[PDB]
Amino acid sequence: MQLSHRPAETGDLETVAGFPQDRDELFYCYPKAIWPFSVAQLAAAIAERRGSTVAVHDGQVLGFANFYQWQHGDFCALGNMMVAPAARGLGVARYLIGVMENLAREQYKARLMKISCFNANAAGLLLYTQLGYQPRAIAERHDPDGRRVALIQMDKPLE
Numbered sequence: 751m752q753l754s755h756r757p758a759e760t761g762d763l764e765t766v767a768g769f770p771q772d773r774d775e776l777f778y779c780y781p782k783a784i785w786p787f788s789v790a791q792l793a794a795a796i797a798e799r800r801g802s803t804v805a806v807h808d809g810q811v812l813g814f815a816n817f818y819q820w821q822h823g824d825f826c827a828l829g830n831m832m833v834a835p836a837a838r839g840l841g842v843a844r845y846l847i848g849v850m851e852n853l854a855r856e857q858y859k860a861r862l863m864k865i866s867c868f869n870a871n872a873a874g875l876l877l878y879t880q881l882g883y884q885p886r887a888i889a890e891r892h893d894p895d896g897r898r899v900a901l902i903q904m905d906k907p908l909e
């Protein structure tokens with residue numbers, strides 16, 4: 751499964767905004783967004799974040815991520831981790847997270863990556879655990895129906 755990466759471009763937005771397949775998936779990767787997702791909502795996140803990057807395989811954009819927090823010499827916080835529905839479980843998020851870790855180290859001199867994952871997203875919790883992230887705290891948040899959820903705040907030292 752050969753993959754490459756590059757900064758996200760305007761032309762990618764419609765593709766990436768196609769990735770979340772339901773309100774749960776949108777909530778897990780962008781909890782401030784409102785279903786249905788849209789290019790305007792994706793562009794607004796890009797404009798206020800840093801490091802928006804796509805993963806590409808065989809001419810297809812298959813993954814997207816960015817940083818929603820960045821503190822030079824300190825840490826970055828990874829967000830908006832989205833994978834194309836036809837490419838789930840094939841290593842795209844693993845790949846892109848590694849790219850983003852290098853970007854945090856190289857550009858931001860980060861010592862730490864933070865990832866926060868909602869409790870219902872088992873696939874995410876297990877992936878981040880496989881990649882060496884450890885849970886540090888649990889924060890209460892609310893979902894779009896007003897129901898209480900647990901945000902599991904994880905981190906990993908970089909090198």
Ligand SMILES: [Zn+2]
Pocket residue numbers: 755849
């Ligand atoms: Zn690169």
Ligand SMILES: [Zn+2]
Pocket residue numbers: 807808
């Ligand atoms: Zn292929």
Ligand SMILES: [Zn+2]
Pocket residue numbers: 890891892
């Ligand atoms: Zn509350």
